[PDB]
Amino acid sequence: DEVX
Amino acid sequence: DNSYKMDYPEMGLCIIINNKNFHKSTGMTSRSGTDVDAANLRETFRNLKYEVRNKNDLTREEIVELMRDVSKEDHSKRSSFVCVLLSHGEEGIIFGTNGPVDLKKITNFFRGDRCRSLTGKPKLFIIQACRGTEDDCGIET
Amino acid sequence: HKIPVEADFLYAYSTAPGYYSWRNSKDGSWFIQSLCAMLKQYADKLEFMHILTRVNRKVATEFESFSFDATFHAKKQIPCIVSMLTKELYFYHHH
């Protein structure tokens, strides 16, 4: 999971 | 009267802007997984009978040019318009590979008075992008 | 005889104002994953706002971030439907  | 007329010859265009790689100055790391989204959206809208056009890694200038050109097309035989933006973002902003551009600049091209062939027709903008840096800790239910 | 120039726009934001939006490197973004799934399952029946409402529920309930960095761990997300639409939208047509 990564953040935009 | 209560429902948009969707029986024009074409459902309309589905423009997908898939930005994965950015210039270091943006400080944005490669958006791993975005190609999965792009492919998923292409198939999904294909099944809805939309004319899908995928575009990858566009600079902020290219995004504006693309939107301008698309808004200048004759959409008379199209029931609606869809634009999907996949990229980094901030509140009210979407990122080109080289920097930020206001979402308002993009959507304005399609205003009821600037894109006459889409007047009275649904214009959808689907935006997968950050709108700031706040996180939601949630609450147990 | 005239309609607002801002009318008939629908902005389906992946997240609420001011917030992060999550994307999984293997499966794609939570929002797009959910959007496509709900469209595939309900576009032949439900009105768009109702499909998007199910997307909101799917993203809100089935996803939670996992990170080795506690600062980005166990986070949640809710999409944001912004509608200036004046009519119901169905991707099907009764002929």
mmCIF file of N, CA and C in Angstrom, chain B residues 10-69:
data_model
loop_
_atom_site.group_PDB
_atom_site.id
_atom_site.type_symbol
_atom_site.label_atom_id
_atom_site.label_comp_id
_atom_site.label_asym_id
_atom_site.label_seq_id
_atom_site.Cartn_x
_atom_site.Cartn_y
_atom_site.Cartn_z
ATOM 1 N N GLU B 10 -23.540 6.710 -29.874
ATOM 2 C CA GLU B 10 -22.372 6.312 -29.089
ATOM 3 C C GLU B 10 -22.531 6.702 -27.625
ATOM 4 N N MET B 11 -22.034 5.858 -26.723
ATOM 5 C CA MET B 11 -22.095 6.170 -25.297
ATOM 6 C C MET B 11 -21.196 7.379 -25.066
ATOM 7 N N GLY B 12 -20.089 7.422 -25.798
ATOM 8 C CA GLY B 12 -19.167 8.533 -25.670
ATOM 9 C C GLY B 12 -17.748 8.079 -25.414
ATOM 10 N N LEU B 13 -16.858 9.044 -25.213
ATOM 11 C CA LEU B 13 -15.457 8.753 -24.961
ATOM 12 C C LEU B 13 -15.152 8.508 -23.490
ATOM 13 N N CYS B 14 -14.105 7.729 -23.243
ATOM 14 C CA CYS B 14 -13.633 7.475 -21.892
ATOM 15 C C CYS B 14 -12.136 7.709 -22.001
ATOM 16 N N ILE B 15 -11.699 8.899 -21.600
ATOM 17 C CA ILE B 15 -10.285 9.261 -21.658
ATOM 18 C C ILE B 15 -9.609 8.871 -20.349
ATOM 19 N N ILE B 16 -8.588 8.025 -20.437
ATOM 20 C CA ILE B 16 -7.862 7.585 -19.252
ATOM 21 C C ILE B 16 -6.435 8.115 -19.273
ATOM 22 N N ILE B 17 -6.095 8.952 -18.301
ATOM 23 C CA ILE B 17 -4.743 9.497 -18.207
ATOM 24 C C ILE B 17 -4.060 8.739 -17.076
ATOM 25 N N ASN B 18 -3.088 7.911 -17.445
ATOM 26 C CA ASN B 18 -2.373 7.061 -16.503
ATOM 27 C C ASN B 18 -0.942 7.528 -16.257
ATOM 28 N N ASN B 19 -0.737 8.305 -15.196
ATOM 29 C CA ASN B 19 0.605 8.798 -14.891
ATOM 30 C C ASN B 19 1.280 7.946 -13.823
ATOM 31 N N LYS B 20 2.358 7.282 -14.227
ATOM 32 C CA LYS B 20 3.097 6.392 -13.341
ATOM 33 C C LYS B 20 4.466 6.912 -12.908
ATOM 34 N N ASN B 21 5.220 7.465 -13.852
ATOM 35 C CA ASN B 21 6.565 7.971 -13.568
ATOM 36 C C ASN B 21 6.602 9.491 -13.540
ATOM 37 N N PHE B 22 7.186 10.050 -12.483
ATOM 38 C CA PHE B 22 7.255 11.499 -12.337
ATOM 39 C C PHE B 22 8.671 12.037 -12.244
ATOM 40 N N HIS B 23 8.810 13.327 -12.525
ATOM 41 C CA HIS B 23 10.107 13.985 -12.453
ATOM 42 C C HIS B 23 10.480 14.070 -10.976
ATOM 43 N N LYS B 24 11.747 13.819 -10.662
ATOM 44 C CA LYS B 24 12.215 13.848 -9.278
ATOM 45 C C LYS B 24 11.804 15.086 -8.493
ATOM 46 N N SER B 25 11.735 16.230 -9.166
ATOM 47 C CA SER B 25 11.364 17.475 -8.502
ATOM 48 C C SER B 25 10.007 17.390 -7.803
ATOM 49 N N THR B 26 9.143 16.495 -8.274
ATOM 50 C CA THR B 26 7.819 16.344 -7.674
ATOM 51 C C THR B 26 7.902 15.571 -6.366
ATOM 52 N N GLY B 27 8.980 14.807 -6.204
ATOM 53 C CA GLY B 27 9.154 14.016 -5.000
ATOM 54 C C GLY B 27 8.183 12.849 -4.934
ATOM 55 N N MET B 28 7.564 12.528 -6.066
ATOM 56 C CA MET B 28 6.602 11.432 -6.127
ATOM 57 C C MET B 28 7.242 10.150 -6.642
ATOM 58 N N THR B 29 7.147 9.091 -5.851
ATOM 59 C CA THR B 29 7.709 7.811 -6.244
ATOM 60 C C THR B 29 6.772 7.141 -7.246
ATOM 61 N N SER B 30 7.337 6.293 -8.101
ATOM 62 C CA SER B 30 6.577 5.581 -9.126
ATOM 63 C C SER B 30 5.263 5.038 -8.565
ATOM 64 N N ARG B 31 4.160 5.302 -9.264
ATOM 65 C CA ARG B 31 2.848 4.849 -8.809
ATOM 66 C C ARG B 31 2.574 3.385 -9.152
ATOM 67 N N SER B 32 3.346 2.500 -8.526
ATOM 68 C CA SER B 32 3.210 1.064 -8.726
ATOM 69 C C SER B 32 1.763 0.621 -8.571
ATOM 70 N N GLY B 33 1.295 -0.179 -9.523
ATOM 71 C CA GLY B 33 -0.067 -0.674 -9.479
ATOM 72 C C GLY B 33 -1.037 0.107 -10.348
ATOM 73 N N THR B 34 -0.638 1.291 -10.804
ATOM 74 C CA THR B 34 -1.540 2.091 -11.626
ATOM 75 C C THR B 34 -1.874 1.447 -12.974
ATOM 76 N N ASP B 35 -0.968 0.633 -13.513
ATOM 77 C CA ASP B 35 -1.244 -0.023 -14.790
ATOM 78 C C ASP B 35 -2.389 -1.022 -14.633
ATOM 79 N N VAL B 36 -2.502 -1.605 -13.444
ATOM 80 C CA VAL B 36 -3.582 -2.546 -13.165
ATOM 81 C C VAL B 36 -4.894 -1.755 -13.242
ATOM 82 N N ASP B 37 -4.911 -0.572 -12.632
ATOM 83 C CA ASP B 37 -6.097 0.289 -12.669
ATOM 84 C C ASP B 37 -6.457 0.643 -14.107
ATOM 85 N N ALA B 38 -5.452 1.072 -14.867
ATOM 86 C CA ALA B 38 -5.662 1.478 -16.250
ATOM 87 C C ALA B 38 -6.272 0.366 -17.094
ATOM 88 N N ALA B 39 -5.758 -0.849 -16.935
ATOM 89 C CA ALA B 39 -6.264 -1.991 -17.689
ATOM 90 C C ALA B 39 -7.676 -2.347 -17.237
ATOM 91 N N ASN B 40 -7.903 -2.287 -15.928
ATOM 92 C CA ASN B 40 -9.204 -2.605 -15.350
ATOM 93 C C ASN B 40 -10.255 -1.630 -15.892
ATOM 94 N N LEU B 41 -9.923 -0.345 -15.876
ATOM 95 C CA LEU B 41 -10.828 0.695 -16.366
ATOM 96 C C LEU B 41 -11.109 0.552 -17.862
ATOM 97 N N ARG B 42 -10.072 0.223 -18.625
ATOM 98 C CA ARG B 42 -10.220 0.064 -20.066
ATOM 99 C C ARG B 42 -11.259 -1.016 -20.362
ATOM 100 N N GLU B 43 -11.105 -2.170 -19.725
ATOM 101 C CA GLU B 43 -12.025 -3.288 -19.923
ATOM 102 C C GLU B 43 -13.420 -2.961 -19.410
ATOM 103 N N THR B 44 -13.484 -2.390 -18.214
ATOM 104 C CA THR B 44 -14.763 -2.038 -17.610
ATOM 105 C C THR B 44 -15.585 -1.106 -18.496
ATOM 106 N N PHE B 45 -14.968 -0.031 -18.977
ATOM 107 C CA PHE B 45 -15.687 0.899 -19.827
ATOM 108 C C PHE B 45 -15.890 0.362 -21.240
ATOM 109 N N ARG B 46 -15.048 -0.580 -21.649
ATOM 110 C CA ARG B 46 -15.223 -1.178 -22.965
ATOM 111 C C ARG B 46 -16.553 -1.926 -22.918
ATOM 112 N N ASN B 47 -16.786 -2.629 -21.813
ATOM 113 C CA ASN B 47 -18.017 -3.391 -21.650
ATOM 114 C C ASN B 47 -19.235 -2.492 -21.528
ATOM 115 N N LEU B 48 -19.018 -1.220 -21.207
ATOM 116 C CA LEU B 48 -20.129 -0.274 -21.103
ATOM 117 C C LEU B 48 -20.320 0.428 -22.446
ATOM 118 N N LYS B 49 -19.536 -0.010 -23.430
ATOM 119 C CA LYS B 49 -19.577 0.505 -24.793
ATOM 120 C C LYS B 49 -19.008 1.908 -24.984
ATOM 121 N N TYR B 50 -18.017 2.269 -24.174
ATOM 122 C CA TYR B 50 -17.374 3.569 -24.316
ATOM 123 C C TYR B 50 -16.165 3.423 -25.220
ATOM 124 N N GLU B 51 -15.857 4.494 -25.941
ATOM 125 C CA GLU B 51 -14.708 4.527 -26.833
ATOM 126 C C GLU B 51 -13.559 4.920 -25.913
ATOM 127 N N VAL B 52 -12.779 3.934 -25.482
ATOM 128 C CA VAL B 52 -11.676 4.181 -24.561
ATOM 129 C C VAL B 52 -10.375 4.603 -25.231
ATOM 130 N N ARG B 53 -9.734 5.616 -24.659
ATOM 131 C CA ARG B 53 -8.452 6.102 -25.153
ATOM 132 C C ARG B 53 -7.534 6.202 -23.942
ATOM 133 N N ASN B 54 -6.494 5.374 -23.915
ATOM 134 C CA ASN B 54 -5.538 5.382 -22.810
ATOM 135 C C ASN B 54 -4.320 6.228 -23.181
ATOM 136 N N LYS B 55 -3.871 7.047 -22.237
ATOM 137 C CA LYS B 55 -2.697 7.892 -22.425
ATOM 138 C C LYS B 55 -1.807 7.706 -21.198
ATOM 139 N N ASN B 56 -0.515 7.475 -21.421
ATOM 140 C CA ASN B 56 0.417 7.242 -20.321
ATOM 141 C C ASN B 56 1.476 8.326 -20.129
ATOM 142 N N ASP B 57 1.818 8.578 -18.867
ATOM 143 C CA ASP B 57 2.839 9.557 -18.491
ATOM 144 C C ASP B 57 2.814 10.864 -19.282
ATOM 145 N N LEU B 58 1.788 11.672 -19.043
ATOM 146 C CA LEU B 58 1.647 12.950 -19.722
ATOM 147 C C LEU B 58 2.121 14.088 -18.831
ATOM 148 N N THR B 59 2.831 15.046 -19.421
ATOM 149 C CA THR B 59 3.295 16.207 -18.671
ATOM 150 C C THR B 59 2.045 17.041 -18.410
ATOM 151 N N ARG B 60 2.139 18.027 -17.524
ATOM 152 C CA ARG B 60 0.981 18.861 -17.241
ATOM 153 C C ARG B 60 0.521 19.612 -18.487
ATOM 154 N N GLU B 61 1.465 19.941 -19.364
ATOM 155 C CA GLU B 61 1.134 20.648 -20.596
ATOM 156 C C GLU B 61 0.393 19.716 -21.553
ATOM 157 N N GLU B 62 0.830 18.462 -21.622
ATOM 158 C CA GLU B 62 0.190 17.488 -22.498
ATOM 159 C C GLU B 62 -1.234 17.182 -22.035
ATOM 160 N N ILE B 63 -1.456 17.192 -20.723
ATOM 161 C CA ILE B 63 -2.791 16.931 -20.192
ATOM 162 C C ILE B 63 -3.735 18.040 -20.647
ATOM 163 N N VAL B 64 -3.288 19.283 -20.507
ATOM 164 C CA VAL B 64 -4.095 20.429 -20.910
ATOM 165 C C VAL B 64 -4.371 20.396 -22.414
ATOM 166 N N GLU B 65 -3.353 20.076 -23.209
ATOM 167 C CA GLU B 65 -3.533 20.025 -24.657
ATOM 168 C C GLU B 65 -4.528 18.936 -25.049
ATOM 169 N N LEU B 66 -4.402 17.774 -24.417
ATOM 170 C CA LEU B 66 -5.288 16.645 -24.693
ATOM 171 C C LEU B 66 -6.735 17.001 -24.383
ATOM 172 N N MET B 67 -6.955 17.582 -23.207
ATOM 173 C CA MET B 67 -8.297 17.971 -22.784
ATOM 174 C C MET B 67 -8.875 19.020 -23.724
ATOM 175 N N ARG B 68 -8.053 19.991 -24.104
ATOM 176 C CA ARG B 68 -8.506 21.031 -25.015
ATOM 177 C C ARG B 68 -8.948 20.400 -26.328
ATOM 178 N N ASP B 69 -8.096 19.550 -26.898
ATOM 179 C CA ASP B 69 -8.410 18.883 -28.159
ATOM 180 C C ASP B 69 -9.684 18.048 -28.063
#
